[PDB]
Amino acid sequence: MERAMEQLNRLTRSLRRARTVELPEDNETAVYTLMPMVMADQHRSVSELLSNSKFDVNYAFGRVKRSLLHIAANCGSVECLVLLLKKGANPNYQDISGCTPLHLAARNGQKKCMSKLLEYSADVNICNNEGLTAIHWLAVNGRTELLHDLVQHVSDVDVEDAMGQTALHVACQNGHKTTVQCLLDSGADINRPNVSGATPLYFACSHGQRDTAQILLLRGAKYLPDKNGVTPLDLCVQGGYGETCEVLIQYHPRLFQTIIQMTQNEDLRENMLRQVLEHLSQQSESQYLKILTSLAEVATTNGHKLLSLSSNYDAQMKSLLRIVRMFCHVFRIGPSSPSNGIDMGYNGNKTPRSQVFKPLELLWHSLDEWLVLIATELMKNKRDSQDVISMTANRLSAVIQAFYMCCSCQMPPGMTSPRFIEFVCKHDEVLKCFVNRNPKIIFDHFHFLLECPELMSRFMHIIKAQPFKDRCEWFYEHLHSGQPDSDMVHRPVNENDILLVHRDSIFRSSCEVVSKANCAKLKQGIAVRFHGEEGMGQGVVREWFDILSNEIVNPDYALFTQSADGTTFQPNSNSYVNPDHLNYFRFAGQILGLALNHRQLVNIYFTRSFYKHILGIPVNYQDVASIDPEYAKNLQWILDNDISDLGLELTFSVETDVFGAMEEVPLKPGGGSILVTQNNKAEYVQLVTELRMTRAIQPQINAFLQGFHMFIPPSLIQLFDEYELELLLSGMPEIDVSDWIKNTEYTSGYEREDPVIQWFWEVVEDITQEERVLLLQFVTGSSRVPHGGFANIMGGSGLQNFTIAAVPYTPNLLPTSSTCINMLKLPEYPSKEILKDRLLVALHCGSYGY
Secondary structure, three states: OOOHHHHHHHHHHHHHOOOOOOOOOOOOHHHHHHHHHHHOOOHHHHHHHOOOOOOOOOOOEOOOOEOHHHHHHHHOOOHHHHHHHHOOOOOOOOOOOOOOHHHHHHHHOOHHHHHHHHHOOOOOOOOOOOOOOHHHHHHHOOOOHHHHHHHOOOOOOOOOOOOOOOHHHHHHHHOOHHHHHHHHHOOOOOOOOOOOOOOHHHHHHHHOOOHHHHHHHHOOOOOOOOOOOOOOHHHHHHHOOHHHHHHHHHHOOOHHHHHHOOOOOOOOOHHHHHHHHHHHHHHOHHHHHHHHHHHHHHHHHHHHHHHOOOOOHHHHHHHHHHHHHHHHHHHHHOOEOOOOOEOOOOOOOOOHHHOOOHHHHHHHHHHHHHHHHHHHHHHHHOOOOOOHHHHHHHHHHHHHHHHHHHHOOOOOOOOOOHHHHHHHHHOHHHHHHHHHHOHHHHHOOOHHHHHOHHHHHHOHHHHOOOOOHHHHHOOOHHHHOOEOOOOEOOOOOOOOOOEEEOOOOHHHHHHHHHHHOOOHHHOOOOOEEEOOEOOOOOOOHHHHHHHHHHHOOOHHHOOEEEOOOOOOEEEOHHHHHOOOOOHHHHHHHHHHHHHHHOOOOOOOOEOHHHHHHHOOOOOOHHHHHHOOHHHHHHHHHHHHOOHHHOOOOOOOEEEEEOOOOEEEEEOOOOOOOOOOOOOOHHHHHHHHHHHHHHHHHHHHHHHHHHHHOOOOOHHHHOOOOOOOHHHHHHOOOOOOHHHHHHOOEEOOOOOOOOHHHHHHHHHHOOOOHHHHHHHHHHHHOOOOOOOOHHHHOOOEOEOOOOEEEEOOOOOOOOOEEEOOOOEEEEOOOOOHHHHHHHHHHHHHHHHOOO
16 A cells, blocks of 8 residues: 555664664764654654663753653654653753643644643643743644643643733633633633733723624623723724624623714724724614714704803814714615615605704704894994904804705715705805905815805805905915815825836827826826936926927917917817817816926916816907907997997808808807897807807817816816916016016007106006006916017017007096007096096906906
8 A cells, every 4th residue: 555665664664773772972863863763653662672771861952952752742652651751751841942842742732642741740830931831822723622631630720821811811812712612611710800900801802803702791701891991892993893892782782872972082093983883884774773863962962062152162173073974974874774784765764864863953943043143243233343253153163064064965966955055045144254254264164065066156155255365365375285175285195107208209108198197196296207218306397397388389280379469379270180189188188287286387378268268257259359350340340339220130140160161050059040139139249259269169178178177176266267377377477667668659649758647657556466467468468578578578469569549538438458459548537636536446447347
């Protein structure tokens, strides 16, 4: 058979060293003298031949200071151990490690070996130098049935290890149940404390173990704390261990309520309790409602106490909100059936809303009363006015946030609560006193209320009379201190996402590289690199933007063209000729947010119209001057003379090239047959402006916004106008006043030093920086200069100069501008008081309408 080699050569090695020889005088050879023979099952014959000998095993061999008796416990034979025990070989003799032969047979499971040592009265209590013993060694090793056969021979089981831990305390820490099954049968103590008071119970919950804690309760363990007071319960929380907590509750239902009281404990990890409750909510519906209803009684308590003027603000204020993010989170998970998964809570299925929101309503009735005060206050105090607005308005704004957080749970994604709406209009006169009191509360408490887009759409009540010098700080303050739509605050960190740039053609190459790379991966110092060239750590970056700036307007690509003013750029309507047409546009919009979000500027300026579309704003008829003034004039004739005197009627459906034939298409959808009624030409002026650009462009423009919106929240930059926006991109320009004085050209009636003009510039010197800059746009659109300055005016109608002309009339009329000529136009203001009254007043309303 296969193991016959072992059968034969067990007899052979007897012959090969048959003649007897005494063991070595040295410690190195004795292990060499017998170790193969013991393994080779000579254990009986060696016990026969070494019955006559003169050496002892305890003269330990080699560096390790072990014995063959340790090997005797290893290799698993007794008949040699018969003779070894006749010699009196001390089992409790130890290595340098302090270990025994027993631990080997324990480690190896040689049962009969473990027996005979105790027949020699082995001191089991001798721990090694590490402080661990056999019984400890086995429970961890999960070897129980021997431990039944072992522990029976001793009564000192309670005797601890070096540190005080019993094997029972160990097994619970490891979850070795059947081990524990035997130890208790063998007379183990249950509530035996460690030095710290740690029962085996405390150890199990630390480990997150279920089934053993079930058992200790059956056999009648006790729920106790440690020395410092920490319970088993606080562990499973800190562990996130849900199912173990469920077991305790079957035997101590008082604990459920204790959980709920933990949520107002600041020290805990909110992202652990979600594991617990979200688990128990799924456990059963009869538990489910008890949870939500139980949460609210804490909320209703804290709120009335929050409104109490004695309570400290910041403490309770999180303690409330620390609850509701779950309470919202649970309802969107919805009612889960008894011992079964989720149910929706649809109509007819018990109306969860009928009960759970009920305890709260006192909070909202309580709420409205204070606001009713303030209305009577503000209305009746307006002539004779610490003020409660100054004192406690910070508090209420905590609660109003609670009223959007709750109501938006019982509506679908992205859909507004109607009940919230009516609440706003009732008190709209009051809320405006808070925003003017503190504008940037809008970022913290009223965040979603006024920056969720469809609400921002609806809640323009406030966004206008939102003060505007607020914006003046906020070109930069809410860029540098962030723009908190949850993400313009901190960045991720990314290193190994390097871009290989193709210097020879960056545009087409980088089109690919970006569309691969992911979004948040690029909100950091971008790893700009070329093919096989380091160049610079990051200073190379600026080449990438600055160069792409001129390559988008690379006219051979046919993306953009100049205005009639020759200075500003706009998208080419006939760009449809391209084979690949739209995909390039998407590349652009991805750029600008990165120039923005990393707050480095760009040198290009576009036409004023193109900004109005980005902000979703409508166009006016002046915006046609970029493409062709003649239509703008032709549209002006319509306003110059009403249709009452008109003989040539217009059609509301006109031949137009849209990258096709001169197709006559309706100006209004379907109503292409009507004509210019006296009450209808306003729309005719309107749609010719819109649908000349829109219909030709709208497939193009949108791809730009998909990427520009990718890295930017649209809800924020509705903040800015169209005249504040171009400055974040190309920087606040420089203005030499003298250079602007010298290049003037006075004409059409005015002389260069009449009283009015001397008094004009007197007003300008009083003006700020962000208003003179808007004057320039009002007459040139363009907002910034070339190198040579105003002496090197780009002009556009040629490189012509900042010019002025007259339109004489009494001060009733206001200024006007002609852009392409880069000329200003002024009705006369015949006095310095007229100037000091009308001009100072006329410029502002003239320089911008609200």
